[PDB]
Structure formats: C-alpha cells, structure tokens
Amino acid sequence: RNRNLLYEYAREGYSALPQLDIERFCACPEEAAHALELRKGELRSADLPAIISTWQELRQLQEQIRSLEEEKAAVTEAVRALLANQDEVQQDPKYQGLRARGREIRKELVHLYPREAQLEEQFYLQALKLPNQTHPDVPVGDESQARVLHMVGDKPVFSFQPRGHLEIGEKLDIIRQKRLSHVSGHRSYYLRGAGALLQHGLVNFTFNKLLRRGFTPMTVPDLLRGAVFEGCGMTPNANPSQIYNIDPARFKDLNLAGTAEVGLAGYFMDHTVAFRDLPVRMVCSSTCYRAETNEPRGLYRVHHFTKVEMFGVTGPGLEQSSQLLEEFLSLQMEILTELGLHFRVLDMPTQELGLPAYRKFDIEAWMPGRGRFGEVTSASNCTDFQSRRLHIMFQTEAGELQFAHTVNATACAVPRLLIALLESNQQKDGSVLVPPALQSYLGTDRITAPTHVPLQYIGPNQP
Amino acid sequence: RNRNLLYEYAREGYSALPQLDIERFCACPEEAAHALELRKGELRSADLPAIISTWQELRQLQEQIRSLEEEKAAVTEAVRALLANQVQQDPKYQGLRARGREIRKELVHLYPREAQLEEQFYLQALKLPNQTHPDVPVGDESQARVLHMVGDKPVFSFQPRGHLEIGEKLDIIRQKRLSHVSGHRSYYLRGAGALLQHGLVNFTFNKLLRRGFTPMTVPDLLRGAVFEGCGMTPNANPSQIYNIDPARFKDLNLAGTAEVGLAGYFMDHTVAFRDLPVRMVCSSTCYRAETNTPRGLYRVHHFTKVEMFGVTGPGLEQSSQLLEEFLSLQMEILTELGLHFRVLDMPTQELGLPAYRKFDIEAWMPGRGRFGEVTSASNCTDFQSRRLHIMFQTEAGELQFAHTVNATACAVPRLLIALLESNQQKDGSVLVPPALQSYLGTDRITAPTHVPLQYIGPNQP
Ligand SMILES: Nc1ncnc2c1ncn2[C@@H]1O[C@H](COS(=O)(=O)NC(=O)[C@@H](N)CO)[C@@H](O)[C@H]1O
Ligand SMILES: Nc1ncnc2c1ncn2[C@@H]1O[C@H](COS(=O)(=O)NC(=O)[C@@H](N)CO)[C@@H](O)[C@H]1O
C-alpha cells in the first residue's frame, strides 16, 4: 500500500538508505513549520509535529540496542577466559550469572529488533514526503503570486479573429484528435505530414543546438521502476497518480515515464561522477506518458508527448548549481526567441514549486487562439533532494564521495509549441507560416492545403 | 477478460462485425486443414471441422429465427385487418393472439442461443489465419529460401569483439546494474551511440520522405482491438503486449510496432482510389515483453523503429508490388550503410497469422558470428482490412476492402550491433559509415574524454 520503494530497496540490500537533512530543519522548528505551510504541500505544518516525535523515539530504541549489543558481545569473551583460566567448570555462580545476563539481554533484543524496523520504516515514510528548501527570492503564495522576471516579443496582430490550433490542423489534416476514443483514447493525437515534420524539425533543431553547446546526448529506458520516480520526488504512490503502471500481475515495478528526468537520474543512481567531469550537461529525447486525469479539449493536455530534456549534475556549491539553472533558462529563452515566439519568464511561487524544487522557472508562451500564456517550458534546481535519495554522488580529487546537485529543464515540449507556432503563424486562408529556423526541416515557408483526400468515416455510428 | 475485443465492438455498436474468408475454408475443408497444419499456428486441422460445424448450427438457427419472425408479422397484420373490418369475442382472433404469444416466447428463448453461437464462431474464426503465397516455402526457419545476398563478410586481423564490450569501452551503451532501475534487457545509449540511433532514424526517415512517404506520428498507448485487428493477440497467456493496470486504466496497451497506430488511423475509415498507393513512414518507441519467446541489444524491451506501412489498391499485385518496393527500399538502406545482408523468404511456420507473404533481411553481425534479423517485410492482404474495416472507394463509389503491407525501415538495436561489430577496429575504435558521418560528426568513434561512472552502491563488498 503506502510503502516507500526506496526504503524497501534498502531493506533487501538493493540500495542504501536515503540520507536526509532533517537535523537542520529540526534546529529551527518555527522556521521549518512556516516554510512547509508556504508550500501548501500534502504535508503542511499540521502533519509536521508527528514526524519530529517519530524521529525522537527512533533514536532512543537504537541507543538501547547499541548498549545491549556491547554488553552481550563482551560477556562471551570473558566467559571463554574463565573456563580455561579456572581450569568445577560451571560451579562458580559468576559463570552461571554471566550466561543468565546474556540470555536476558538476548530476550530483550529479540523483542527490541522488530520495534526498530517498524519505526525506521515509519520515520522514513514521513521523511520521504518532506519538501525541499525554498530559495530566499522565491515568490511566496499561489500561482497568482508568481513574479514575471522577463517578457520578450509582441502579440501577433490579426485582422481576422484567429482560429484554434486543432481547427487549423484538422483543416490542413496535419492533426487528428477525432474518432480516436476506441483506438487510442481521449486526449490522443495523430500528427500528419507537416505536423509530423514540425515535431521532427523542432526536436532536431533543439537537439542540434544543445549538442553544439556541449550537451552530452543520451537515450533513456522508457519503462522504469517506481523507486526512481520517488527519488526524482515524483509521487508514484498518490491516488491521483499521473504515472501509468504495467499490470502488477503480468510484470512488477514497471512504470511508464512522463519525462526523461527520471531516466537520466537512473543513470546516475548509486554512481559517482568525477569532479573534473563536472559540470555534467546531458540532452535526451523521449516519448513521455502522463495520465493527467485531473476539463479542456485540444492538444494543450495529452497523455503522450515527445519531449527534449536538458539535465545536469553540478558541483558542491549551491551557487554552482544555480548557475546551471540560469544557463538552462537562457537556452530555453533563446530557442523560443529563435522560433519567433512571444513569451514571459515567471519565477514560480512556493505553491507551484513542488517537493524536489529549490527554485523553478517556468516560461509561458502567448497562444492567440487560447488568448492565454501557457507553460511551454519548466526549469528547476532540485539541489541535493534527488541526489540524496538516489545516491547520485560526486567524488573529489581527495577520494571523498559527496552528494551532488541536480538541475532539470525542458528544451522542447512538442504539443504546446505546435499550438503556439500554428496559432501565432496562422493566416486567414488557413496557411501557417513555417518559422525560418524550421523552414529547412519542413521544406516550405507555408503549410498549405493537402493534395490528398482526407479519410471519411465508414462506421455504423454515423447518423 | 477472455473476450475478443473486436466482437465486443460490434456488440456495443461502436463498430461493424468483422467480415471473414471462412467461406473458402468450408468449401475445401481438407485443403484448408493441410494449409493450417503447415502453419503450425494456434489453430490446427482437427480444430477446423468444429468451426465448420459451429457455422452450420449458427446459420441454420438464424434461418429458423427469420422463419418464425415472418410468421409473427403475418399474424399481427391479419389481426389488424379483422380490427379494421369490425372483437376479443371472435374465436380465430383469440387463436391468432395466442399463436403470437407462442412465437414471441419461442423467439425469446432462441435469441440468446444465436448470440452465444455468434461469439463462439467469431472468437475461433478470428484465430483463423490468412492465406499463403504459393512461392512461400513450407517448414520451420531452417527451411528459409535466400532470395538475395549482398556484400561480403568483413575481414578482421583481430578476433571480432562483441558490441557490449565495444560499447562499454567507449561508454556508448550501458546494460550494467540496471535491474533495480529499468529491468533486464534494458539499455542506456550515451554519446555516439545516441548519435548513431539519431542518425539512423533521421537518415532512414529522410530517404523515405524524399521517395514520397507521408510522415505520421502515432499515439503510443492504444486499445486492444487494434492489436487483434493487426493479427496480434493481447489475450494470449505468454503475451508480448505490455498492459497498463486494468484496474487503474481501461484497455490501454503499449505498442511493439507503429503498425498498430497506423492501422488505427485507417480503421473504420475509407481512402480514395487516386490516393492509392498510400505510403506512410512513422518513428515509434516500441515496447515488447518477450517472455523467453540472453543479453546485449539483440533482444530488448524498448526499441526505436521506423516503419513503412502502406494501404494499396484492390489487386493482390498492387499489394505485392508495394512489398517488393518496400524490400527494395530496405535493401538500399542496408547497403548505403555498407552492410553484408541476406534477404530470406520466410517459411509458413514463421509467416505469422496475418501474413500472406513475408520477406525478412538478416545482417552479418561478426561478434555473434551469425546472421540476425533486422527487417521484416510482409503483405497482410485483406486480413487486417476485414478486421479493422479499412476500405477504399472506387471511381463509381463502391467501398471495397483494402490491402495493407508493413515493413521495418530501420530497427535501431540490431543495426547498431552490426555496424559496431562489422566496422570495429583493433584499437577499439569503430568507423562511422559514410552516410551516417554527418549526423555523428566524425569518421570514427574513439575513446571518450569523460570518466566512466563508478558504483557507490552497497552491493559491492
Ligand atoms: N499533459 C501534458 N500535455 C501536454 N504537454 C505537457 C503535459 N505535461 C507536461 N507537458 C509539457 O511539458 C512541459 C514541462 O513539463 S513539467 O512537468 O512541467 N516539467 C518537466 O517535465 C520537467 N521534468 C522537465 O521536463 C510543460 O510545460 C508542457 O510543455
Ligand atoms: N525484442 C527486440 N529487441 C530488439 N530488436 C527487436 C526486438 N523485436 C523486434 N526488433 C527489431 O524489429 C525488427 C522487426 O521486428 S518484427 O517483429 O520482425 N517485425 C515487426 O516489428 C513488424 N511489426 C514490422 O515492423 C526486427 O528485425 C528487429 O530488428
């Protein structure tokens, strides 16, 4: 049921126990409670007091067990000398008393050991839900409180009232989201011709730009075990799960990934990277699956999406980690400006930061048909939260293994970008202007009506 | 559950009942039984007569159902006629009403028996295979026929070394300590290996686009019936189809080819004659369970594959020409990568349920020391069209069942193995084939600047 896979991995010896910075949080209790409330996370300040109590009791049981073991191991050596040194083997009641002391402590330990396991499991489960710290400049509050740091571009001015992405696509037969209920499901999309080329072009353009800027290219397994998701700070256990799961009966611990952050993290799990290699910048393109059951219609929310992701393992300094975030943001902003898109960079507030994020920058791009700015990219400094759980480490020249910092950002979310590109570059005739960067991949300056005859329904449902 | 989703679609009224070629089986039961046996599929000669018998019981029961129904209408009309001419008093009137009640009760009992027979005939019928080209060889994979052999085995001063060793040395592939992270037969490709996959897909896609293939993007999560339509069995006990938790989500299954999605696009929809032949190219992340049906990238659960699919004109020759066109494109791609490959006509046992003809290409992989399948090309004829209602409209306007052909343009895992093993060098470097040089950016893959990751884990003692 509600079991931390990471603790279970420690239990079977698969992985070590997650390390936590609980002592620092305990050192300032009033400050700690205030921080959590700002997060408005599942564990708000109300759930906090019980964890402190669980932690305190756990320490004591260990103390007792430690003392008992020292006494228990000691007596055996002492008796060994007595039988040989006495040279009437068991007559001295001291010999008799010593055996008795061992048995009573052994009995006490046999009772004590199960209680230690139950408590260790309990404290870790509550700790697993403990949120990351918040950067001082982070705006505090709901999405509305989020700050707008930089705005680039001007809203496209249209003579006509602009049409929506799906309408333009279906008219050009480049997007199909219709008659797909009994084949692929609700919110499922097929991209045809230019739409497919547009995705391929956007992914290839972003991949090439990042590869040139020193990103190391990688391919990630798309089916991954749940412990990794918990390590990335994603919640596999929760009821409104966005994570699709392979049938447990058929296969165990296999969960589809909604990003490549999870996969890239898996590569670094339980492994160390040399300080000299750091910083580590990596780029991956993956098919991403997210349930998102939690109601609009269109490509804005969909179950399957192809996304190019930027990930990095950075050095010890929190300041060193923050630099990567700004670099990632700069690149994110550059790709969008190069695509001719109007966008605004928002420092995210505590309520939207999420459990693993010290600071998050999200970029909203103007979509004319929606008439709204919508997240097209997310950038987050996860600091050591992910490193501590999955054991991503950096080894210094000295030989020391120390926890590393993880930064994650989105280069290309094909679904939303198509909406921005199609709606913004729309023309009254219904033609869409291929932005200059992608013109090479697409092969044209305008997406024009197709030569082909579109599919027509031959099903019984037609009325 | 154990239901054939296709029948349920008809039951729920979502789609029409699958049409089928069982009539040919009934016409020549002996000939069909010999053909079914040569296939060695789920069904067997002995199974066919029961299917033939089940058809007889169903059709006869339906004919009786119509006969009684005709009578019930006759009585109602005669009763209405008596009512117009004029009541309960009339002696025959009461008789007619009672006869009507009797026919109604008899129909009510007969109705369910027909439905049970329909499901039984259909579920066994859908396990019935497509026909085979006469040229198709008969027997196991041992009895394959080699249509063509291109290239020559690479010459090596050193003993050839395997892809996994070459990969780990250059840190382009990882299959180590992934058990608690992604599973066995799971792999991570890094640097040049990622570039090689990106290049192979982009190279293959580009050639196809230039030859006029239409680009497509297929939803990875698909409902089960489409798999059944393509001739794949999700209900099988040793299923190679990964299923999302049924309790959590309904009928969402992962795809092992894009064949399924592309078929869905054409399902229960019609194409115009002018468009034919319709050629589409898709790139898909393909997932396959493969429950023992050893290591390395030869058999893996996640793979990237570019698939050529086409819906052709009415003639079988129209389908066959596309198959040869598809193999031709496949052979060219392999050659342009400087690979030694053999084209094999697959025998009946290996054809598969929806296959009229299958041509597969095996490539020379030196470290293994054996040839290996990299491509499958097949003509499914009308088997898929009949099941998923993929149809074309003639100039007059008749809607008729189409023919579908499927072929693997590029399968990244096995091809990476051969290019790496075949183009290997003693220094441990691997030479980038000229076509892929632009994408990789180098003529040879050499040792990496970075330091390989080191396990900090507990399992080490
Ligand atoms: N259900 C969805 N439908 C469409 N696009 C989505 C969906 N979920 C996420 N995305 C896209 O993915 C972008 C980033 O996703 S995110 O979850 O916010 N953040 C991440 O994924 C980070 N792990 C880095 O990629 C969103 O801006 C949006 O562009
Ligand atoms: N488990 C696997 N591991 C690695 N490669 C695989 C695996 N399954 C299939 N492939 C690759 O995909 C190619 C085609 O596979 S196939 O099942 O024969 N044919 C199909 O996939 C058809 N659906 C057409 O694509 C194989 O030759 C091989 O190159």
> Amino acid identity, residue B259?
E
The helix (H) or strand (E) run that includes residue A313 is: strand A304-314
Breaks (C–N over 2.5 Å) after residues, chain A: 87, 294
Distance CA A12, CA A16 (A): 10
Residue B229 in 3-state DSSP? helix
The answer to whether the beta carbons of residues B173 and B164 sit under 8 Å apart is yes
Ligand 1: atom nearest CA of A375 is: 27
Residue with tokens 């165990």: A252
Distance CA A176, CA A191 (A): 6
Contacts of B451 by beta carbon, 8 Å cutoff, 6+ apart: A273, A274, A276, A277
**Closest among B424, B324, B294 to B364, alpha carbons compared:** B424
Catalytic residue among B161, B299, B342, B368: B299
> Amino acid identity, residue B326?
F
Choosing from B129, B150, B174, the residue where a domain stops is: B129
In a domain, B7, yes or no: no
Q: Helix %, strand %, coil % for chain B, to 5?
A: 40, 20, 40
The answer on A182 and A103 residing in a single domain is no
Task: Tell me, in angstroms, the distance from the centre of ligand 1 to residue B86's CA.
Answer: 77
Burial of A95 (0-12, 13-18, 19+ CB in 10 A): middle
Find the residues whose C-beta lies inside 6 A of ligand 1. Answer: A 259, 261, 290, 292, 301-302, 305, 307, 309, 375-378, 408, 410, 413, 415-416
The answer on A287 and A206 residing in a single domain is yes
The helix (H) or strand (E) run that includes residue A97 is: helix A93-128
Experimental structure resolution, Å: 3.0
Residue B278 in 3-state DSSP? strand
Distance CA B56, CA B50 (A): 10
Choosing from A131, A158, A178, the residue where a domain stops is: A131
Strand order through the sheet with B188-190: A147-152, A343-347, A359-367, A372-383, A405-413, A304-314, A280-289, A216-219, B188-190, B173-174
Q: Establish whether B376 is a catalytic residue.
A: yes
The answer on B285 and B420 residing in a single domain is yes
Contact B182 A13 (CB under 8 A): no
Q: Find how far residue A115's CA is from the centre of its chain.
A: 33
Q: What angle is formed at CA A427 by the lines to CA A424 and CA A433, rounded to 5 degrees?
A: 65
The answer to whether the beta carbons of residues A134 and A34 sit under 8 Å apart is no
Count A/B contacts: CB-CB distance under 8 Å. Answer: 228
**Cis omega before residue A279 (within 30°)?**
yes
* Contact residues, chain B, for A245 at CB < 8 Å: 244-245, 248
The counts of H helices and E strands in chain A are 14, 18
- Beta strand pairing call for A392-395 and A271-274: parallel
The answer to whether the beta carbons of residues A195 and A299 sit under 8 Å apart is no
B152 in the Ramachandran plot: left (φ > 0), alpha (ψ -120 to 50) or beta? beta
The answer on A200 and A105 residing in a single domain is no
Residue B148 in 3-state DSSP? strand
Distance CA A306, CA A298 (A): 16
* Contact residues, chain B, for A270 at CB < 8 Å: 177, 455-457
Looking at ligand 2, which residue's alpha carbon is closest to its atom 26?
B374
CB-side exposure of B10: number of CA atoms within 13 Å?
A: 16
First to last CA, chain B: 47
- Would the CA dihedral through A452, A453, A458, A462 be positive or negative? positive
Residue B296 in 3-state DSSP? coil
Burial of A116 (0-12, 13-18, 19+ CB in 10 A): middle
**Closest among B424, B426, B434, B429 to B448, alpha carbons compared:** B429
**Closest among B190, B156, B196 to B444, alpha carbons compared:** B196
Contact A250 B242 (CB under 8 A): yes
Distance CA B217, CA B261 (A): 9
Look up residue B402 and give its two tokens: 């189409």
The helix (H) or strand (E) run that includes residue A147 is: strand A147-152
Burial of A11 (0-12, 13-18, 19+ CB in 10 A): middle
Q: Which of B453, B454, B455, B459 to mutate to test the interface with A (most CBs of A within 10 A)?
A: B453
Distance CA A203, CA A411 (A): 9
**Closest among B75, B19, B11, B32 to A182, alpha carbons compared:** B11
Distance CA A126, CA A442 (A): 51
Distance CA B86, CA B83 (A): 5
The answer to whether the beta carbons of residues A299 and A166 sit under 8 Å apart is yes
CA distances to B229, B234, B248 from B226, rounded to whole Å, are 5, 10, 21
Look up residue B296 and give its two tokens: 């390395």
B398 in the Ramachandran plot: left (φ > 0), alpha (ψ -120 to 50) or beta? beta
* Contact residues, chain B, for A271 at CB < 8 Å: 453-457
The answer on B165 and B282 residing in a single domain is yes
Q: Establish whether B444 is a catalytic residue.
A: no
Angle formed by the axes of helices B5-12 and B91-126, nearest 10°: 150
The answer on A297 and A199 residing in a single domain is yes
Contacts of B242 by beta carbon, 8 Å cutoff, 6+ apart: A223, A246, A250, A251, A254, B253, B254, B287, B288, B289
Distance CA A349, CA A146 (A): 5
Contacts of B215 by beta carbon, 8 Å cutoff, 6+ apart: A192, A193, A196, A197, A200, B205, B209, B280, B281, B282
Look up residue B91 and give its two tokens: 């002696």
Contacts of A88 by beta carbon, 8 Å cutoff, 6+ apart: none
The Cα of B152 is separated from the nearest Cα of chain A by a number of Å equal to 32
CB crowding B28-66: b at 16 or more within 10 Å, else e: eeeebbebbbbbebebeeeebeebeebbeebeeeeeeee
The answer to whether the beta carbons of residues B347 and B401 sit under 8 Å apart is no
Count the Cβ atoms, other than its own, within 10 Å of residue B289. Answer: 20
> Amino acid identity, residue B153?
K
Contacts of A426 by beta carbon, 8 Å cutoff, 6+ apart: A158, A162, A163, A168, A368, A369, A432
Q: What angle is formed at CA A46 by the lines to CA A227 and CA A146, rounded to 5 degrees?
A: 75
**Closest among A22, A49, A6, A53 to A130, alpha carbons compared:** A22
The answer on A152 and A230 residing in a single domain is yes
SS (H, E, C) A208-259: HHHHHCCCEEEECCCEECHHHHHHCCCCCCCCCCCCCEECCCCCCCCEECCC
In a domain, A14, yes or no: no
The answer to whether the beta carbons of residues B439 and B428 sit under 8 Å apart is no
Angle formed by the axes of helices A48-86 and A29-39, nearest 10°: 130
Task: Tell me, in angstroms, the distance from the centre of ligand 1 to residue B26's CA.
Answer: 55
Catalytic residue among B283, B284, B319, B376: B376
Distance CA B93, CA A166 (A): 63
Breaks (C–N over 2.5 Å) after residues, chain B: 86, 293
* DSSP symbols for A381-394: EEETHHHHHHTEEE
The Cα of A114 is separated from the nearest Cα of chain B by a number of Å equal to 23
Nearest to A218 among B14, B188, B226 (CB): B188
The answer on A251 and A270 residing in a single domain is yes
Distance CA B107, CA B384 (A): 35
Q: What angle is formed at CA B42 by the lines to CA B38 and CA B43, rounded to 5 degrees?
A: 70
Q: Helix %, strand %, coil % for chain A, to 5?
A: 40, 20, 40
Look up residue A40 and give its two tokens: 């408005």
Angle formed by the axes of helices B412-422 and B163-170, nearest 10°: 80
CA distances to B72, B74, B82, B92 from B86, rounded to whole Å, are 22, 19, 6, 14
Length of chain B: 461
> Amino acid identity, residue A323?
Q
**Closest among B49, B51, B382 to B231, alpha carbons compared:** B382
Distance CA A45, CA B365 (A): 61
**Closest among A257, A319, A252, A310 to A284, alpha carbons compared:** A310
Contact A189 B245 (CB under 8 A): no
Look up residue B410 and give its two tokens: 């590029």
* Contact residues, chain B, for A15 at CB < 8 Å: 180, 457-458
Distance CA A283, CA A210 (A): 7
The answer on B94 and B185 residing in a single domain is no
The answer to whether the beta carbons of residues A286 and A267 sit under 8 Å apart is no
Choosing from A102, A131, A160, the residue where a domain stops is: A131
The answer to whether the beta carbons of residues B393 and B272 sit under 8 Å apart is yes
Ligand 1: atom nearest CA of A377 is: 27
* DSSP symbols for A175-193: EE-SS-TTTT-TT--EEET
Task: Tell me, in angstroms, the distance from the centre of ligand 2 to residue A224's CA.
Answer: 21
Q: Find how far residue B145's CA is from the centre of its chain.
A: 23
Contact A273 B182 (CB under 8 A): no
Residue B249 in 3-state DSSP? coil
Task: Tell me, in angstroms, the distance from the centre of ligand 1 to residue A208's CA.
Answer: 21
The helix (H) or strand (E) run that includes residue A413 is: strand A405-413
* β-sheet bridge partners, residue A393: A272, A403
Look up residue A10 and give its two tokens: 């420690």
Q: What is the CA radius of gyration of chain A?
A: 29
First to last CA, chain A: 47
Experimental technique used? Answer: X-ray
Q: Establish whether B350 is a catalytic residue.
A: no
Contact B270 A455 (CB under 8 A): yes
Q: What residues make up the domain containing B319?
A: 130-445
* β-sheet bridge partners, residue A372: A367
Count the Cβ atoms, other than its own, within 10 Å of residue B399. Answer: 13
Distance CA B304, CA B284 (A): 6
The Cα of A416 is separated from the nearest Cα of chain B by a number of Å equal to 15
In a domain, A192, yes or no: yes
CB crowding B315-338: b at 16 or more within 10 Å, else e: ebebbbbbbebbbebbbebbeebb
Residue with tokens 């990277």: A273
Distance CA B172, CA B428 (A): 12
CA distances to B161, B421, B431 from B157, rounded to whole Å, are 11, 13, 15
CA distances to A15, A68, A121 from B457, rounded to whole Å, are 6, 30, 20
In a domain, B459, yes or no: no
Q: Establish whether B373 is a catalytic residue.
A: yes
Count the Cβ atoms, other than its own, within 10 Å of residue A65. Answer: 16
CA distances to A97, A415, B137, B226 from A303, rounded to whole Å, are 70, 11, 44, 18
Torsion angles phi and psi, residue B443, rounded to 5:
-90, -20
Residue B11 in 3-state DSSP? helix
Look up residue B286 and give its two tokens: 């393909």
The answer on A390 and A305 residing in a single domain is yes
The answer to whether the beta carbons of residues A393 and A404 sit under 8 Å apart is yes
Torsion angles phi and psi, residue B244, rounded to 5:
-70, 155
Distance CA B145, CA B345 (A): 5
The answer on B286 and B260 residing in a single domain is yes
In a domain, B147, yes or no: yes
Look up residue B58 and give its two tokens: 């169903």
Distance CA B357, CA B345 (A): 8
Contacts of A391 by beta carbon, 8 Å cutoff, 6+ apart: A15, A16, A269, A270, A271, B456, B457
Q: Establish whether B414 is a catalytic residue.
A: yes
**Chain B: residue nearest A453 by CA?**
B272
Say what the alpha-carbon torsion angle A201, A202, A204, A205 is, to the nearest 10 degrees: 110
The helix (H) or strand (E) run that includes residue A416 is: helix A414-424
- Would the CA dihedral through A44, A45, A50, A53 be positive or negative? positive
**Closest among A375, A403, A192 to A316, alpha carbons compared:** A403
Residue with tokens 């997210």: A290
Burial of B116 (0-12, 13-18, 19+ CB in 10 A): exposed
- Ligand 2 proximity of B373 Cβ (cutoff 6 Å): yes
Count the Cβ atoms, other than its own, within 10 Å of residue B85. Answer: 6
Q: Which of A5, A247, A285, A441 to mutate to test the interface with B (most CBs of B within 10 A)?
A: A247
Look up residue B99 and give its two tokens: 């006869």
Length of chain A: 463
In a domain, B8, yes or no: no
Residue B178 in 3-state DSSP? coil
Long-range contact set of residues A236-242: C-beta below 8 Å, sequence gap at least 24:
A236/A5, A237/A2, A237/A3, A238/A42, A240/A293, A240/A294, A241/A291, A241/B248, A242/A290, A242/A291, A242/A292, A242/A293, A242/A294
**Closest among B191, B179, B163 to B455, alpha carbons compared:** B179
Say what the alpha-carbon torsion angle B440, B442, B445, B449 is, to the nearest 10 degrees: -100
Q: What angle is formed at CA B379 by the lines to CA B378 and CA B382, rounded to 5 degrees?
A: 140
In a domain, B229, yes or no: yes
Distance CA B461, CA B457 (A): 9
The answer on A57 and A108 residing in a single domain is yes
**Closest among A28, A26, A22, A48 to A37, alpha carbons compared:** A48
* β-sheet bridge partners, residue B424: B430
Residue A80 in 3-state DSSP? helix
Q: Indicate the number of domains in chain A.
A: 2
Distance CA B328, CA B311 (A): 17
Residue with tokens 């692929």: A184
**Closest among B47, B23, B21 to B33, alpha carbons compared:** B47
Residue A32 in 3-state DSSP? helix
> Amino acid identity, residue B189?
L
* DSSP symbols for A319-349: HHHHHHHHHHHHHHHHHHHHTT--EEEEEPP
Contacts of A122 by beta carbon, 8 Å cutoff, 6+ apart: A54, A58
In a domain, B5, yes or no: no
Q: What is the CA radius of gyration of chain B?
A: 28
